Amino acid sequence: GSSGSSGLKMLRDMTGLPHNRKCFDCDQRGPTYVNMTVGSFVCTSCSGSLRGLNPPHRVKSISMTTFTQQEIEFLQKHGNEVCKQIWLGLFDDRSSAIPDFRDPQKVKEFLQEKYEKKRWYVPPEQAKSGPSSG
């Protein structure tokens, strides 16, 4: 048959996507972490920041830490592809702008308004139409 790495094979494919090439916050080209809560791909820098928030999200390195199928699939079915958009529902290049990716205070104060405040928080359950329009 074939052997090399279990699960990891599916991971390298996730962080490989063109919508993951960069971080979720600092948009740094080269993510080394993944949020189990949001289901996105962050880096060591952000990974640590997110925790500071409350409640503290869940982050796990990509190479420093391993993952299981139940997890991989969860991250694959999510990915920054839709995740981001779902968090940027209201966000509009015109409505607002993007901070800098050098200072933590800036990335933090912003990340909060996305999670702590959930300003541009627009889930799909409602975004799309269905048999139940609350």
Instruction: Summarize as ranges the residues that interact with Zn ion (CB under 5 A).
Output: 23, 25-26, 28, 43, 45-46
Collapsed DSSP state (helix, strand, coil) of residue 61: strand
Q: Before 55, cis peptide (omega within 30)?
A: yes
CB 56 within 8 A of CB 85: no
Task: Between 64 and 127, name the residue whose CB sits nearer to Zn ion.
Answer: 64
Task: Between 109 and 125, name the residue whose CB sits nearer to Zn ion.
Answer: 109
Closest approach, Cβ 123 to Zn ion, in A, equals 23
Closest approach, Cβ 77 to Zn ion, in A, equals 22
Rounded CA gap, 121 and 6, in Å? 34
Task: Between 11 and 26, name the residue whose CB sits nearer to Zn ion.
Answer: 26
Closest approach, Cβ 5 to Zn ion, in A, equals 25
Helix (H) or strand (E) holding 74: helix 69-76
Q: What angle do CA 75, 76, 81 make, to 5 degrees?
A: 95
Task: Between 26 and 86, name the residue whose CB sits nearer to Zn ion.
Answer: 26
Closest approach, Cβ 44 to Zn ion, in A, equals 8
